[PDB]
From a paper:
Each of these domains contains one binding site for unfolded proteins or peptides. Often, FKBPs are linked to an additional chaperone domain that can increase their PPIase activity by up to 200-fold.
The activity profile for peptides with alanine residues in different positions confirms the importance of W4 and F13 to the enzymatic activity in the full-length context, while removing the methionine side chain in the M8A peptide increases the enzymatic activity. Although most of the protein–peptide complexes did not crystallize or yielded crystals of poor diffraction quality, we succeeded in structure determination for four complexes of SlyDWT with bound substrates: psWT, [name], W4K, and M8A. In all structures, the peptide substrates are bound in the PPIase binding pocket with the proline residue in cis conformation, coordinated by the previously observed protein–peptide polar interactions, namely N35-L9, I37-L9, Y63-F11, H119-F11 and Y92-F13. On the other hand, the conformational flexibility of the residue i − 6 is also reflected in our crystal structures.While residue W4 of the original S2 peptide forms a polar interaction with the [name] residue E60, orienting the N-terminus of the peptide outside of the binding pocket, mutant peptide residues A4 and K4 do not form this interaction and as a result, the peptide N-terminus bends towards the [name] linker region. Taken together, while different side chains at position 4 assume distinct conformations in each substrate variant, these conformations proof to be unspecific when compared to the structure of other variants. This resembles encounter complexes where initial contacts are unspecific and contribute to the association reaction, but not to the dissociation step where they are replaced by specific contacts. When both binding sites are fully occupied, the two domains restrict access to the PPIase domain binding site in the tight conformation.
Numbering used by the authors:
A (entry chain A): 1 to 150
B (entry chain C): 1 to 11
C (entry chain B): 2 to 15
The structure:
Amino acid sequence: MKVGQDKVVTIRYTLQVEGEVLDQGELSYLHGHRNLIPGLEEALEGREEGEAFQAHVPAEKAYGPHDPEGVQVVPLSAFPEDAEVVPGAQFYAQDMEGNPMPLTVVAVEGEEVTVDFNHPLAGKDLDFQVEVVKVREATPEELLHGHAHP
Amino acid sequence: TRYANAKMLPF
Amino acid sequence: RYANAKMLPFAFGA
Ligand SMILES: [Cl-]
């Protein structure tokens, strides 16, 4: 069974940016519904179960470019009082539609805390070693929901 | 970009 | 803007 539309695909992957490997894992995802970065998805389309390969995905095709307008500053008022505001910590805020917008705090300067709304991998190209371990037809319920059930 | 008068929430 | 932000494998927000 080959990777294709409406098939739940389980793969294990190693990620390298520039030359540094930054993560390794196993994931299953539903193919064809925008659940996986496009460049990866395009590499996987058609692969037969068992195939193993290397894939290079430019930033535009994975997480996009870094947007300068995505880095902003808000008072420490906004952060919770129990909370630790330290470089690296991650929080969410609320958009006008009401939906959460996540951020990673970049710097704290007294009253002013600067945060970054970009994806952490924005602007960085990615290198992958990938193993396709299983492709299965999707379940009706996965199809109504839009996601593989983990 | 876009921000609201609502406080952030922990990880 | 960041329409890719939630896509796998490394997904920003959940
Ligand atoms: Cl999925």
